[PDB]
Amino acid sequence: MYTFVVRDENSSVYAEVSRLLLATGQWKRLRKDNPRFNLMLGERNRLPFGRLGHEPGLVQLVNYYRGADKLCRKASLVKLIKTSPELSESCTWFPESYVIYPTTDEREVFLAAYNRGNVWIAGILISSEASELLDFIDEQGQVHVIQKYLEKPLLLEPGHRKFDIRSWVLVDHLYNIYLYREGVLRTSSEPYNSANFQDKTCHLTNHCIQKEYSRYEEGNEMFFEEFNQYLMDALNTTLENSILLQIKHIIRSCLMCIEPAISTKHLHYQSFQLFGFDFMVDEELKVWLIEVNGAPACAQKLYAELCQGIVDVAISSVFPLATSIFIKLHH
Amino acid sequence: MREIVHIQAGQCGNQIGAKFWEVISDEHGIDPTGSYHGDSDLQLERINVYYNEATGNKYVPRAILVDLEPGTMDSVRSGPFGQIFRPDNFVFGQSGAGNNWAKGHYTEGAELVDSVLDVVRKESESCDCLQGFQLTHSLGGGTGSGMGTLLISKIREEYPDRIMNTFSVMPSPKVSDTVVEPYNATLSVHQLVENTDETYCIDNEALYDICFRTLKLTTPTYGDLNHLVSATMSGVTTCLRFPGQLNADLRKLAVNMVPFPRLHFFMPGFAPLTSRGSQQYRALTVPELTQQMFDSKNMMAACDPRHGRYLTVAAIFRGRMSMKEVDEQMLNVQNKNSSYFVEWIPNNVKTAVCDIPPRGLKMSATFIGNSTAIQELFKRISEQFTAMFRRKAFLHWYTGEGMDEMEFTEAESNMNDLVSEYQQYQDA
Amino acid sequence: MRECISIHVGQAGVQIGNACWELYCLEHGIQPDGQMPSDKTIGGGDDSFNTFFSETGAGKHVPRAVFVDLEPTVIDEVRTGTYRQLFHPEQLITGKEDAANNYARGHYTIGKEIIDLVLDRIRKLADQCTGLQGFLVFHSFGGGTGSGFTSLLMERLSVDYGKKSKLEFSIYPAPQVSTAVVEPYNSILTTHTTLEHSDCAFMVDNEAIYDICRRNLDIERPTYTNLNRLISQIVSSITASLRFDGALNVDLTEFQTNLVPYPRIHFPLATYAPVISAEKAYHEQLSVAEITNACFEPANQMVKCDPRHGKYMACCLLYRGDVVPKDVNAAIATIKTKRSIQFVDWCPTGFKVGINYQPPTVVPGGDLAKVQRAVCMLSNTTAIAEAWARLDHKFDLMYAKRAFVHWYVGEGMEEGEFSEAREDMAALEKDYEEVGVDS
Amino acid sequence: MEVIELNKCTSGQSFEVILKPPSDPSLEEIQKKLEAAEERRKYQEAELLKHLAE
Numbered sequence A: 001m002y003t004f005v006v007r008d009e010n011s012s013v014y015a016e017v018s019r020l021l022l023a024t025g026q027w028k029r030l031r032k033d034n035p036r037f038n039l040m041l042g043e044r045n046r047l048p049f050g051r052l053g054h055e056p057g058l059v060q061l062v063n064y065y066r067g068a069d070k071l072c073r074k075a076s077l078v079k080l081i082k083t084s085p086e087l088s089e090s091c092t093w094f095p096e097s098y099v100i101y102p103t104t105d106e107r108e109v110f111l112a113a114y115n116r117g118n119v120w121i122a123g124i125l126i127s128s129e130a131s132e133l134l135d136f137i138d139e140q141g142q143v144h145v146i147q148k149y150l151e152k153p154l155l156l157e158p159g160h161r162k163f164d165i166r167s168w169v170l171v172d173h174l175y176n177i178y179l180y181r182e183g184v185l186r187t188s189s190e191p192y193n194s195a196n197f198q199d200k201t202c203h204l205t206n207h208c209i210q211k212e213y214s215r216y217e218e219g220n221e222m223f224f225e226e227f228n229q230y231l232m233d234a235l236n237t238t239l240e241n242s243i244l245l246q247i248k249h250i251i252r253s254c255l256m257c258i259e260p261a262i263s264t265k266h267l268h269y270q271s272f273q274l275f276g277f278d279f280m281v282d283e284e285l286k287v288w289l290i291e292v293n294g295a296p297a298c299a300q301k302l303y304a305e306l307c308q309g310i311v312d313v314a315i316s317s318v319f320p321l322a323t324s325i326f327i328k329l330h331h
Numbered sequence B: 001m002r003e004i005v006h007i008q009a010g011q012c013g014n015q016i017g018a019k020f021w022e023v024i025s026d027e028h029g030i031d032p033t034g035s036y037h038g039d040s041d042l043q044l045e046r047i048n049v050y051y052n053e054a055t056g057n058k059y060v061p062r063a064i065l066v067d068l069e070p071g072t073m074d075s076v077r078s079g080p081f082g083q084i085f086r087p088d089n090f091v092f093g094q095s096g097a098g099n100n101w102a103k104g105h106y107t108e109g110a111e112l113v114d115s116v117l118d119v120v121r122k123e124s125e126s127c128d129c130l131q132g133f134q135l136t137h138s139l140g141g142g143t144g145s146g147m148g149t150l151l152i153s154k155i156r157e158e159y160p161d162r163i164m165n166t167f168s169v170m171p172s173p174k175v176s177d178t179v180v181e182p183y184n185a186t187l188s189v190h191q192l193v194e195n196t197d198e199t200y201c202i203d204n205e206a207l208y209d210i211c212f213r214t215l216k217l218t219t220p221t222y223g224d225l226n227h228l229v230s231a232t233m234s235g236v237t238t239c240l241r242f243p244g245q246l247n248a249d250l251r252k253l254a255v256n257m258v259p260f261p262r263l264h265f266f267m268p269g270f271a272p273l274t275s276r277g278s279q280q281y282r283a284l285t286v287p288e289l290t291q292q293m294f295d296s297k298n299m300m301a302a303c304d305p306r307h308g309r310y311l312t313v314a315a316i317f318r319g320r321m322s323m324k325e326v327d328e329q330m331l332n333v334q335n336k337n338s339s340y341f342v343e344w345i346p347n348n349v350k351t352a353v354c355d356i357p358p359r360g361l362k363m364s365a366t367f368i369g370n371s372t373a374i375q376e377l378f379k380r381i382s383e384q385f386t387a388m389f390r391r392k393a394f395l396h397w398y399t400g401e402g403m404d405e406m407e408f409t410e411a412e413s414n415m416n417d418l419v420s421e422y423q424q425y426q427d428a
Numbered sequence C: 001m002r003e004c005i006s007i008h009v010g011q012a013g014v015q016i017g018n019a020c021w022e023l024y025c026l027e028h029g030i031q032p033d034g035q036m037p038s039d040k041t042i043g044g045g046d047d048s049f050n051t052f053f054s055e056t057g058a059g060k061h062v063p064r065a066v067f068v069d070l071e072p073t074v075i076d077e078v079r080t081g082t083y084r085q086l087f088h089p090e091q092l093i094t095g096k097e098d099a100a101n102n103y104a105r106g107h108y109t110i111g112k113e114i115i116d117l118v119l120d121r122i123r124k125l126a127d128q129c130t131g132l133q134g135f136l137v138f139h140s141f142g143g144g145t146g147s148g149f150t151s152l153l154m155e156r157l158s159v160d161y162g163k164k165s166k167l168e169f170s171i172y173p174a175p176q177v178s179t180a181v182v183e184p185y186n187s188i189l190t191t192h193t194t195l196e197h198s199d200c201a202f203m204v205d206n207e208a209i210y211d212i213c214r215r216n217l218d219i220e221r222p223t224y225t226n227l228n229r230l231i232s233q234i235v236s237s238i239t240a241s242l243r244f245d246g247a248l249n250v251d252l253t254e255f256q257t258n259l260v261p262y263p264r265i266h267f268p269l270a271t272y273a274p275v276i277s278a279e280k281a282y283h284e285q286l287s288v289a290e291i292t293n294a295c296f297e298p299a300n301q302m303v304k305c306d307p308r309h310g311k312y313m314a315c316c317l318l319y320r321g322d323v324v325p326k327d328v329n330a331a332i333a334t335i336k337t338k339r340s341i342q343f344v345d346w347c348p349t350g351f352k353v354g355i356n357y358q359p360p361t362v363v364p365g366g367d368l369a370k371v372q373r374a375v376c377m378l379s380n381t382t383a384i385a386e387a388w389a390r391l392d393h394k395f396d397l398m399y400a401k402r403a404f405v406h407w408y409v410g411e412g413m414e415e416g417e418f419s420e421a422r423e424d425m426a427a428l429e430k431d432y433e434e435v436g437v438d439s
Numbered sequence D: 001m002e003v004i005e006l007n008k009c010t011s012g013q014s015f016e017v018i019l020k021p022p023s024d025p026s027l028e029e030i031q032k033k034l035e036a037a038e039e040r041r042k043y044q045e046a047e048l049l050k051h052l053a054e
């Protein structure tokens, strides 16, 4: 038997993970403040990392990497790449960006690279004239980032519509970088808008704001067997050669960069974590990185498989019970 | 020298008292005539906690023997170790108490109490650094029960800042057939709640269950019950009588066991269980020790530990064995049954080990739990009490000694509160 | 030359103190009877080691130490033990009955009863000092004496020596060896009351030492003797600079100046290496690179915690044995690029470095192997607050039910002192966070 | 990068190395403290003796 506590009572993904564990007969679930657990499915913010690995008799494992917020906050991600020689200006796959403060920031350095055809982006605001962007952040009181909007994004057919690609990556306690073989495109229901861009819906592929203005895909969800088939017939190539190769590289570079800051190889507790990587595919079949989310939710079709893979790769590796869905990215 | 004054009162209290002495006297290498003949300086290192130093390298139990009738004291005086006791320390009346708490607390017992007290003083007087008192007695009779708790009230008046410790035998209808025992026990528990620091609940219901079901003793005797009671008493006092780090005096034990002043009623547990004459063939392994001493079949209180939660726990291992292994097993226990230990007392299981094992055994373990499941004991007694008290049955045996119903209503109330207090904390 | 007086309080302070003077004596070549062939200043001298030993007309070198336990059992071993000639009786002060693992009982009830006598026997040593600088106070957080008396003694010392410095070596409570469920109470109580009266506190988590003894010395179930020999090693490293020739950390004020820019954040992390088993059939010796890198491994810290997630305010490297700066700076170059070592903006990224050529002295028969070079790092990182968060959580769990509180009230302490202490610690946790917010 | 204040002995050396530059209660109140606490425990007892004498 092993034990685990559940401290983010909203995680879809880890809901299915505890249900899986209970249903094995070898995992008991404790009162969330009972400290005698092996597994902490942990709260989302101010997870009490300093409390882990001080329970003699217990190996302890938690489902976040302390310090992986560096990668998963829109302000820190930018500063991570700019100031980190492994990425820095070894970087061809992250759009131009600057951190900006509604009045150590780059609102000055920004205007410089500004003047050229400039389209940028920010409850989110995209425009083409600086004044109304730099004035929009000065609106609300949260740190904001201004990155080049990809003016020329690959459009799907039949539809002439934009999309983004979610990739789920699980990093286990040895720092194996695993890539679930099933990704998803969150498409757009209405066709991209060439000149002029402020309508949103057709510019923000972000799911929920699409569940509200839609025809081609069940819930605006295209999976990889279809998107590969379209790429073949439509572009005479494959998902693998055209997109995934750059994606796999982008994930490995991002995580290997911060491994020394967050690894737990020689630490008194062990971490694993599931990451949600968000990519743009542009006209020239060049891949771009957008956001990395530390608490991804999954797609309904895929919960069963991913959450069982979480259990088998990242929980039963450390807590063994009585053909992989993942591609290990090799560094 | 952190001394402890021992008081045994009444039949039960005197019979398990003489046995305790008999057993630890051997453990410490003192023979009946009271002289050391042992092979370890460990045996003598803290002999001052229970024996006074006399001339001739002689050790006298710092023990006071009390009863309102002369038997028992007679048989005690002609018992194996009968002669080790200081003879002025036998204080006894003639009338008896007739299994009547009122006679023990209020009438016959009041006549003889002062003379007991003087001997208590004479012993205390002698003490370099008095830890407090340990009293053996039953709760079902008249003397141990009524005069025993009278004595406790007096002693606390004189030594308000010393520790008061009792081994209190609880009555059970499986072992005795006096109809008024639930009265005497409820009147005693009322006092014990108020005036002791630690009480070992030695439950004749559990001693019977162990002896008859587990040890296959089909005609159990008090000798059998007292065999289990003298191993427990040895167990729970190892830390006071040998050199050690954990719970090595009465106050330090009280600070580790008692999180709220009224919940000071412990469940002892012992493994392996043995019949007198069981000639043990192999020793238990450390993992058998641990499974067993937390087993409900091994408790000296008839309560289901899985029906409550442990507030605190002391564990004492004796014999030559592996600290690493004892530690691994004690951690295993708590981590595999962790909902049974209140989480609002982090790390409430403390573990001690004594190289020197008890007589007969190579390996033993002794358990002392402060479980909210002890409420099952008090509930059992309360229900017997109520069944009689709601028709004021058998009350004339008490009102005729001077007592008023009110005193019963209050005892009943204080014990029903005690139970509710144990339930509040098992729901936290 | 200026003297330091050492005060050992409680079982843990006394037993640790004993291991330290055992070690101290080997290092300076003093024999169990105070005699020291090395000293040709027979009867005295102002040598570096005299900061810790005064000298007797007959040639006896006597620790400037004062022991005090609220009960006689442990110190009785020092009176009778193997170094009995070393100390004068007046500096081994015992009471009769102890604090019962009860902070209140050691501060209030039995404090009063022995404070004046301790202050007296202490002033007896200051009077014998040409230029006393302050005190090294050894104690446990978790016992009644170590917590309660120590906070009492500390307040009398500040009143009776405002000019002088006070350093703590404090033992942080670990379940693997603790003897009382109330240790987090006593620990928060004594930290809150000692806080403003201490200048630099070296916190040793029994848990950390315990695992170094299992993992690196192969000790299957460490005792206090294993524990204390290693702590005496680390303590010796931190003090080497006051008993030997050097230009780094040469008096107690410098510890605060080099280690403690913020008065309340005065708890520097110690990390030591290498710990090698003397029973280990030949060990390939470790370089200056290897030992220095090992300084940034949590498994060598005196407190488990992750300095990657936190900033630095100061760092001191204390080497013993075969070290020269070209190797030190070369080592720092390498690790500087591999590890996450962010200082706070108001502090420069740098290391003060001290090298004593004499390799660590081994206690013959102990568990430690002799090594050709050794290092203790004293860094002030906000990551040590982790220890305060764990201890504060345990306190919150108990106190929310008033578990055991009646034992403290029963001794004259008011319930509210509990809440005032815990609030102090709450604010201390905020300080550490403010300073470490960066990444 | 920069090695500062080197200092040599026959026992060791000392030096700083910077890789990157930056950017009381009185005896009185204490006695009040102890005395007041002792009188609370003195009272608590007196209450105890008073209850027992009842």
Ligand SMILES: CC[C@]1(O)C[C@@H]2CN(CCc3c([nH]c4cc(Br)ccc34)[C@@](C(=O)OC)(c3cc4c(cc3OC)N(C)[C@H]3[C@@](O)(C(=O)OC)[C@H](OC(C)=O)[C@]5(CC)C=CCN6CC[C@]43[C@@H]65)C2)C1
Pocket (backbone or CB within 6 Å): B173, B174, B175, B176, B177, B212, B218, B219, B220, B221, B222, B223, B225
């Ligand atoms: C530790 C020492 C002893 O303490 C423990 C006891 C009692 N005692 C005296 C010894 C004794 C026994 N029997 C006797 C019959 C007579 Br004429 C005279 C003496 C005895 C016991 C025995 O047999 O071994 C020696 C003995 C006695 C009893 C017993 C088991 C038992 O032993 C396995 N029950 C659990 C009890 C009993 O009520 C029940 O089942 O329901 C609870 C019994 O009713 C039935 C239907 O059985 C019984 C039997 C007469 C009926 C009248 C009053 N009840 C009180 C005890 C109880 C008894 C040992 C002290």
Ligand SMILES: Nc1nc2c(ncn2[C@@H]2O[C@H](COP(=O)(O)OP(=O)(O)OP(=O)(O)O)[C@@H](O)[C@H]2O)c(=O)[nH]1
Pocket (backbone or CB within 6 Å): C009, C010, C011, C012, C013, C015, C016, C069, C070, C071, C098, C099, C100, C101, C102, C106, C139, C140, C141, C142, C143, C144, C145, C146, C147, C171, C172, C173, C174, C177, C178, C179, C180, C183, C206, C224, C225, C227, C228
């Ligand atoms: N490392 C180490 N810790 C010790 C030692 N002795 C005691 N301790 C620590 O101290 C705690 C118990 O309180 P003590 O410091 O011993 O207090 P004391 O000196 O016995 O005096 P009292 O307060 O009366 O008990 C334990 O939890 C230990 O963590 C020791 O020899 N070595």
Ligand SMILES: Nc1nc2c(ncn2[C@@H]2O[C@H](COP(=O)(O)OP(=O)(O)O)[C@@H](O)[C@H]2O)c(=O)[nH]1
Pocket (backbone or CB within 6 Å): B009, B010, B011, B012, B013, B015, B016, B097, B098, B099, B100, B104, B138, B139, B140, B141, B142, B143, B144, B145, B146, B147, B169, B170, B171, B172, B175, B176, B181, B204, B207, B222, B223, B225, B226, B229
């Ligand atoms: N375990 C055990 N219980 C006993 C023994 N002797 C008596 N008792 C219990 O004590 C109760 C009688 O108490 P009693 O001795 O008459 O009290 P007293 O008259 O005041 O001394 C009975 O209910 C028994 O269960 C004994 O040797 N062992």
Ligand SMILES: [Ca+2]
Pocket (backbone or CB within 6 Å): C039, C041, C044, C045, C046, C047, C050, C055
């Ligand atoms: Ca000299």
Ligand SMILES: [Mg+2]
Pocket (backbone or CB within 6 Å): C010, C011, C069, C071, C098, C143, C145
């Ligand atoms: Mg002590």
